[PDB]
Amino acid sequence: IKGGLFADIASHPWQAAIFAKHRRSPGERFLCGGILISSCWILSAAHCFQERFPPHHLTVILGRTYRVVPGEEEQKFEVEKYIVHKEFDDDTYDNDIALLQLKSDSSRCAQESSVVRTVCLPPADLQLPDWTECELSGYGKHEALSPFYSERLKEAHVRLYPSSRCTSQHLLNRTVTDNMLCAGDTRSGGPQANLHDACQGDSGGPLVCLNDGRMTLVGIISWGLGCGQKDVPGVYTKVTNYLDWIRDNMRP
Amino acid sequence: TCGLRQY
Ligand SMILES: N=C(N)c1ccc(C[C@@H]2CCCC[C@@H](Cc3ccc(C(=N)N)cc3)C2=O)cc1
């Protein structure tokens, strides 16, 4: 997360850290962030799984404030099966969505706690006013230029961009489709050292807004050009466009 | 339930 502030997992119980390993099992590296929707299902970004990993080589860790430092009440699960949206495009990142089924001993996997809780999926008709300030979280880079991921969970705050302003023109000629969302810090000349923004490592993480008293998921950190770049917003997958897909692929 | 946290 570029800019923003350090946050404790309890402020974003729905954040998931997904780790993966290498040949010969030398060590499991931080892959991407995830979003907890139900006890055994977490969403993430399809692009994170472009290397076609064997499920049992993917570990989702819930309830963890520090990226690699194990939490007092965390919950580590192995992936049974992960579904990657078939129409996902690697160039345009169109359809950047995926589901990870958690492996458990019962009908429930993630046991709800003070540090582990689900996000409420957005209603089909969710129409949040342009410029409403939503927040995001992640263990990703602080600078896209940085060689290191964040040792600890971070949170930032972005303003939802109007439909019209979320176009190819406004994003250096990259393909922005109707399945994408734009949000980005809109401050200038303030007291803060960095524009708020997601960054490399935050992918798959949640962009949540307050809706009807509850924190509702609005988008999945998908892509962007740099991090905290003046007048360039960040792109997020429209979760509403995939409410249907989500319900359909959640097979036990 | 979902959407709840600590503030
Ligand atoms: N033409 C495209 N559709 C396109 C362009 C660039 C990328 C880069 C890549 C893809 C993988 C590497 C990290 C990633 C993560 C990331 C997340 C958020 C932000 C932000 N909001 N500033 C920036 C970067 C990213 O955007 C992917 C797709």
Q: Say which CATH number the domain at A103 has.
A: 2.40.10.10
A224 lines ligand 1 (CB under 6 A): yes
Q: Does the beta-carbon distance from B3 to A119 stay under 8 Å?
A: yes
Residue in the structure block whose two tokens are 């609005």: A218
- How far from A182 is each of A89, A168, A235, CA to CA, in Å? 18, 11, 5
Residues A124 and A236 grouped into a single domain: yes
Cα–Cα distance, A189 to A68 (Å, whole number) = 35
Please report the resolution in angstroms: 2.9
Interface-testing mutation among A214, A217, A239, with chain B (most B C-beta atoms within 10 A): A214
Which residue carries 């993430």 as its tokens? A44
Query: Number of folded domains in chain A?
Result: 2
Compute the distance between CA of residue A123 and CA of residue A252 in angstroms, rounded to an integer: 23
Spatial distance between the Cα atoms of A36 and A38, rounded to a whole number of angstroms = 6
Q: Are A14 and A33 in contact (CB under 8 A)?
A: no
Q: How far is A22 from chain B (nearest CA, A)?
A: 34
Which technique? X-ray
| DSSP H or E segment with residue A11 | none
Quote the distance between the C-alpha of residue A189 and its chain's center: 28
Range(s) of the domain holding residue A123: 1-12+119-240
CB-CB neighbours of A235 under 10 Å: 27
Task: Indicate whether A48 and A70 sit together in one domain.
Answer: yes
